[PDB]
Structures are given as structure tokens and as C-alpha cells.
Amino acid sequence: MVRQYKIHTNLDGTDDKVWDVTNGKVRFYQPSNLGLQSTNNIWQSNGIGVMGTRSITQPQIEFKLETFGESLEENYQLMKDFVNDILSKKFVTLEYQTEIFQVYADLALADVTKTEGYGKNGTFSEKITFDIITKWYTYENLTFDKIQN
Amino acid sequence: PTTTIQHAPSETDPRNLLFINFASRNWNRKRITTRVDIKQSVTMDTETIVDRSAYNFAVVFVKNKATDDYTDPPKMYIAKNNGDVIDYSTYHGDGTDLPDVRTAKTLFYDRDDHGNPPELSTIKVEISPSTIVTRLIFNQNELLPLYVNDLVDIWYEGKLYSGYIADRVKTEFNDRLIFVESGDKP
Ligand SMILES: [Ca+2]
């Protein structure tokens, strides 16, 4: 039904670690932009328009990162863990999931914030920005086809 | 020329080799006739194949034997539109057979051992015109593709230019060609 956001350390890998940013303790909210920007190289001669090649540019995704710890100790351990896990691997695979599709985007940590403006039981509300490596790709199994008489 | 890395022709020889290419898709090259539209981001610039001098008019001075000085007045030589070189004083025409702009230079010559003035032909070589050649850089047309080392006859803005495809740029955005007009028109 609703949208799902997984954060994989190494998708396709034996050492994969999955973070549910939609259901788990560390949650991602309000993505900045999931769309795209394009530079079409349109040069015009005497009012007539000629179009070059479109360079589809992908923009940084900024999430409202929230932590759901029970104690100040929990919320700090969640920030010290989640952020370092993204740092340990050179790039992290964000999975976009919905009723119709299951796309993936390879992200690199652009900016993470840590402030002392806490709620109840030391709750965290910070902004996490990621740089786009490759936006939306389908990771699927490939198998041979058999021919029958 | 095009440099290419390719494994040795014989299956016995396991070596990877580097060779230089001076070969074409056709052994006996044929001339193509095509059109280049202004939409292909065309860049027109003039190249010079042969080195010949640029001052079409010559204020020629001849040194006097008796004074061993340039005491005598100069003789002016003008190159006609046809290609011939005549003395300016000898001209009796209406200006139609002479150039549209007068590029001039002053030349100094020393009299030969015989004492005779320098040959008209020797002056002619120095005032003679250079090969004005047109270069066209444009986008690759998928309707009629033009590859490197192909003899072509390009139509651009109502004017016909004849020559070959010298270079080709493989970029991320476009695929472009360098056309060099070989000249030798009349
Ligand atoms: Ca991997």
C-alpha cells in the first residue's frame, strides 16, 4: 500500500545490512526532490529552434532524518551507528518501494547534521543530504529460456 | 592517418600489434555529393594549403650601377584577376580585370652580375596569390553519414565546396566532422 524506503550497505552482497527508514528506529521523511533536471542544449537560429543532446542531471536528495529511541542513550547509539554504517561503505543503496515498482538509487553521503535541540527522551530531528551516483535502476534476476518440442 | 591496435593476422602469432592506417572502405575512392544545412551548427573558417605572398602590388626598386645606390625611381607592378603580373604604367583598362583591394609592399633588389634588371617572373612569384581554402565543421547527419577519408562535394547556403572529411569528434553531446575544400576549382 504505502511507500517503503530501505537503506542497504552492500546490495548484491553477503555483508549486506538493511535499515528501514520507513518502519525502523531511524526514519527518513520528506524527500527534497525525487524527480529530475535536464539540460537540452537548445540553440536558436533566426527564431527557429534546434535541439542538441539532453544531459539528464540528478539532484541531491535531502531527508528529514528522525530517530525513535526510548532513552538519550538509545538516540545517540542510533546516530553513532546509522551514520557510521553509511561511512564504512564508499556508497549506499537506497531502495524506493511502492505498489507498482521497486527501484534503487546509489547514494553517497553529502551532509549530515547533529544538534542539541532535543524533544522527549533525547529525540533527534536532523537533515541528511545525499549525492546521486545513479538514480533509479531495477535489480532483478536474469535466467535462460528453454525451447520445447 | 588513423592509428589502430589489433592482434596479429595469423592465428599462430599470439602478439597484439600497433599499426598506422592509410587505407579506405573503397580501394578506388569515389566522389560523394551532399548538402550541409545551417541547423548542424556549421563553423566556416578559411585555411591556406600553399604558402604564397600577400601584398598584391609591388613598389620595386632597382639599384643604379654607376652610383651603387637606389638613385633611380621605382617601377610599380600589379597582378591581374587572371593571375598575370604587369607593370602599372602599361595598364590601359577599366579596372574590371584588377583586384577589389590593393595590398602593397616595397621590394629591394640587387642587380645581377650581368647587370640586367630582375626578371618579371621572379617578381611574379613574390606577388602571386595563396590557396584560399574553406573549412567546414558540422554535426553528423544520420540521413547521409560522412566518415573520415571520404571524397565529398558539399552544398552550403547555395555555394558548392569540394573536398574531403579530415577529422571526426566523438563527444558526449555531438558527433562532428571537419571538411577541407581541396581547391583546384578552375
Ligand atoms: Ca556492491
3-state secondary structure A4-66: EEEEECCCCCCCCCEEECCCCCEEEECCCCCCCEEECCEEEECCEEEECCCEEECCCEEEEEE
> How remote is the CA of residue A108 from the centroid of ligand 1, in Å?
13
Cα A90 to averaged position of ligand 1 atoms, centre (Å): 10
A53–chain B nearest CA distance, Å:
5
State the amino acid at position B6 in one-letter form: Q
From the number of C-beta atoms within 10 Å of its C-beta (0-12, 13-18, 19+), residue A26 rates as buried
**DSSP character at residue B113:** T
Beta carbons of A105 and A138 less than 8 angstroms apart: no
Neighbours of B139 (CB within 10 A): 19
SS3 B125: helix
In residues, how long is chain B? 186
Q: Do B172 and A55 count as a contact with CB atoms less than 8 A apart?
A: yes
| Maximum Cα interatomic distance, chain B, rounded to a whole number of Å | 82
Question: What span, in angstroms and rounded, lies between the C-alpha atoms of B35 and B164?
Answer: 14
B110 Cβ contact partners less than 8 Å away, ≥ 6 residues apart: B63
Q: Is A55 in contact with B38 (Cβ distance < 8 A)?
A: no
Distance between CA atoms of residues B151 and B162, nearest Å: 8
Asked if residues A141 and A134 have their Cβ atoms less than 8 Å apart, the reply is no
Q: What is the 3-state secondary structure (H, E, C) of B64-99?
A: ECCCCECCCCCEEEEECCCCCEEECCCCCCCCCCCC
Residues of chain B positioned with their CB less than 8 A from the CB of A48: 39
Could you tell me the three cell numbers for B7? 592482434
Write out chain A residues lying below 8 Å of B174, CB-based.
Answer: 52-53
> Closest Cα of chain B to A133: distance in Å?
18
φ, ψ of residue A72 to 5 degrees: the values are: -60, -35
CB atoms within 10 A of CB A140: 6
CA B60, CA B119: separation in Å to the nearest integer?
A: 12
Q: How far is B17 from chain A (nearest CA, A)?
A: 36
Choose among A136, A85, A95: nearest CA to A11.
A95
